[PDB]
Amino acid sequence: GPVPSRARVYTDVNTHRPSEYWDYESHVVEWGNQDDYQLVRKLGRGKYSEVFEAINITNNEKVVVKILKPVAAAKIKREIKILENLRGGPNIITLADIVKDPVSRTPALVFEHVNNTDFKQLYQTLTDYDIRFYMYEILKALDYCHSMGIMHRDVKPHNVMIDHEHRKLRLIDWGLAEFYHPGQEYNVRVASRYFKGPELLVDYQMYDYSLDMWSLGCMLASMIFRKEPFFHGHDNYDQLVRIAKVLGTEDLYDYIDKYNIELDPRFNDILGRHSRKRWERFVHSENQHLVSPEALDFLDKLLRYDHQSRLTAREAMEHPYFYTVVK
Ligand SMILES: CCc1ccccc1-c1ccc(CNCCc2nc3ccccc3[nH]2)cc1C(F)(F)F
Ligand SMILES: CCc1ccccc1-c1ccc(CNCCc2nc3ccccc3[nH]2)cc1C(F)(F)F
Ligand SMILES: CCc1ccccc1-c1ccc(CNCCc2nc3ccccc3[nH]2)cc1C(F)(F)F
């Protein structure tokens, strides 16, 4: 069968934690008062949530209310546990309260209010410096959550809120996040299609924090090449075909051989044979101001088939791409 794998960093963080910390079922529910909140306007949605701007009437403070649909509602204890473990961490969204509607019994998570610059404004105005600055802010969040034994598993632009006026960023929607345990086989039906790592697409279950580094690379390729999404698959099989048309089929086969991964028997018919593409093929007059040899070297070090070969979040912060960022 497949060859085992473990994270190269933060391998044993969750073993130092006591037992029964893991048994969260009818444990520390602690519901707040829903009547403290008045919904003001809809901000947007998650896949299984509706998000509102609200007012806390006991103190007139602006907050964010995330109403959970049944799919997200079922995993609420894990999202609560993860949000509480990471609270106060760099660029992590702050959970402020947990409430339930007594009429529908639907639960909601209440957060610190964070400004969210409109996506159209961000897409046209972020400079080469802005991209380096915000990517460095996301790495601070990923290194922190990875150091705490947690993988986000849904890194994408929609899960990144930017208050551009105050140069502030938050990594949000920890609903798919999970605790990393060495040797554990995880569900591959995580992240969003366009941001799924090759490990997920080839059904390699023993993945780790490195999956977040792949998704971050997809996000970066989209920002510097102004091509959203960068890898635009029609389904999960085609998603791997989109990646192979850029990274090539030779390194993909070296990857599946290294881990002894068995693919669907029709693999050759959809994957074909493709050379590695030069990054310069994606460069044109409208995005050339966002591309540098450092950017491409960084992208190259994130977007690798082999999850063990990708930069960790801490190594990524050391890359020359970030030398012009004020630290
Ligand atoms: C391809 C993305 C992109 C390319 C080039 C420049 C900027 C962006 C971008 C554009 C928008 C955003 C902001 N994302 C937050 C969206 C959002 N609003 C929410 C409201 C409610 C719930 C979730 C929410 N998520 C972040 C980004 C980001 F993070 F910089 F990539
Ligand atoms: C249905 C939305 C919901 C979904 C999931 C969890 C909680 C709620 C909820 C449930 C109740 C309230 C507070 N409702 C107060 C409404 C109200 N204001 C009044 C002012 C004067 C007189 C009567 C009034 N009734 C706030 C909320 C809130 F803000 F969404 F959290
Ligand atoms: C142990 C079963 C087995 C024995 C012999 C040959 C193949 C497999 C196999 C092995 C794995 C899977 C699961 N799906 C593979 C994932 C995948 N992603 C692809 C993307 C593109 C092309 C093929 C792809 N296959 C399905 C299968 C299946 F369906 F049984 F064939």
Side-chain angles (χ1 to χ4, degrees):
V3 170
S5 184
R6 57 157 205 169
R8 290 178 108 173
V9 287
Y10 309 132
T11 318
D12 316 334
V13 275
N14 289 312
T15 58
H16 194 89
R17 296 186 193 272
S19 297
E20 294 146 332
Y21 165 97
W22 304 112
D23 274 19
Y24 47 81
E25 205 165 312
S26 302
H27 265 254
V28 199
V29 296
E30 289 269 75
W31 306 92
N33 302 325
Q34 73 278 355
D35 295 341
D36 281 358
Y37 307 100
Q38 188 198 115
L39 297 183
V40 177
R41 68 176 177 100
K42 181 128 104 54
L43 295 180
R45 305 167 187 180
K47 197 169 168 187
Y48 299 111
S49 64
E50 307 277 350
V51 179
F52 291 81
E53 188 179 279
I55 274 286
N56 181 326
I57 61 162
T58 70
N59 61 19
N60 258 314
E61 283 175 40
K62 283 179 195 181
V63 294
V64 165
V65 172
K66 172 199 186 168
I67 301 162
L68 307 186
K69 295 265 165 174
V71 176
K75 295 265 181 201
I76 201 178
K77 283 178 185 272
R78 183 183 73 187
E79 190 176 350
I80 293 166
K81 192 77 196 153
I82 288 165
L83 284 164
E84 289 185 345
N85 282 303
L86 298 175
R87 191 152 49 204
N91 305 330
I92 316 284
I93 195 72
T94 304
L95 178 66
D97 205 358
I98 311 154
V99 297
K100 186 161 72 176
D101 169 29
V103 167
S104 67
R105 294 300 152 88
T106 57
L109 301 172
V110 186
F111 297 95
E112 58 161 315
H113 185 266
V114 141
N115 265 296
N116 181 56
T117 306
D118 178 83
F119 71 100
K120 293 172 156 79
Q121 159 78 37
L122 293 164
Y123 190 75
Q124 303 301 135
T125 66
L126 296 192
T127 63
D128 169 49
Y129 183 84
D130 290 327
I131 299 169
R132 298 169 197 240
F133 180 89
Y134 289 124
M135 286 287 298
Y136 195 80
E137 292 303 306
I138 298 164
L139 289 160
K140 284 184 195 176
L142 292 179
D143 189 43
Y144 184 72
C145 83
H146 296 167
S147 76
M148 295 294 284
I150 289 154
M151 46 196 171
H152 187 272
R153 300 198 304 179
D154 196 28
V155 174
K156 59 179 186 175
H158 189 78
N159 291 339
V160 172
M161 282 182 170
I162 296 171
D163 175 3
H164 191 45
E165 188 186 37
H166 302 101
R167 293 198 75 116
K168 293 179 179 179
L169 179 146
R170 296 289 179 275
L171 176 55
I172 74 155
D173 202 339
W174 297 82
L176 298 183
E178 190 46 293
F179 290 93
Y180 176 66
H181 298 291
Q184 188 162 144
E185 284 178 321
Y186 294 92
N187 189 346
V188 302
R189 288 181 61 183
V190 296
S192 300
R193 189 191 306 140
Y194 307 141
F195 304 89
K196 288 173 186 272
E199 59 267 49
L200 300 193
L201 306 166
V202 305
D203 289 294
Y204 184 82
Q205 297 187 79
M206 213 179 285
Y207 62 84
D208 60 78
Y209 314 115
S210 52
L211 165 66
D212 291 338
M213 304 309 292
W214 175 274
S215 310
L216 191 64
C218 296
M219 236 194 93
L220 183 66
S222 181
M223 288 210 269
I224 72 180
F225 296 134
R226 312 235 285 166
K227 186 204 181 293
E228 52 170 332
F230 188 71
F231 298 119
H232 193 223
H234 189 82
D235 48 62
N236 291 336
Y237 293 87
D238 187 49
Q239 187 63 29
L240 186 64
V241 173
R242 298 319 182 102
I243 296 157
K245 290 180 169 209
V246 179
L247 301 196
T249 48
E250 193 203 330
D251 297 336
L252 173 53
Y253 286 124
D254 297 342
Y255 174 59
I256 74 153
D257 290 337
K258 175 175 169 170
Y259 293 92
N260 193 31
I261 295 152
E262 211 54 72
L263 295 176
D264 184 286
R266 299 162 296 157
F267 70 90
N268 191 45
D269 296 323
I270 67 151
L271 289 173
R273 187 200 41 97
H274 305 275
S275 54
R276 306 176 182 87
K277 296 316 172 285
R278 307 197 170 273
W279 288 123
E280 6 293 305
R281 212 198 210 89
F282 297 102
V283 182
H284 51 80
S285 63
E286 266 63 40
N287 66 28
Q288 63 163 41
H289 66 291
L290 306 174
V291 185
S292 62
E294 301 77 17
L296 299 182
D297 184 69
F298 184 47
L299 195 64
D300 214 68
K301 277 175 172 75
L302 295 179
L303 297 177
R304 306 202 150 164
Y305 286 117
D306 188 357
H307 55 277
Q308 293 178 11
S309 300
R310 298 182 198 139
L311 294 168
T312 63
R314 195 75 194 263
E315 292 174 312
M317 292 171 90
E318 298 298 300
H319 198 277
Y321 184 56
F322 305 107
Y323 288 173
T324 186
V325 179
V326 177
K327 300 175 219 72

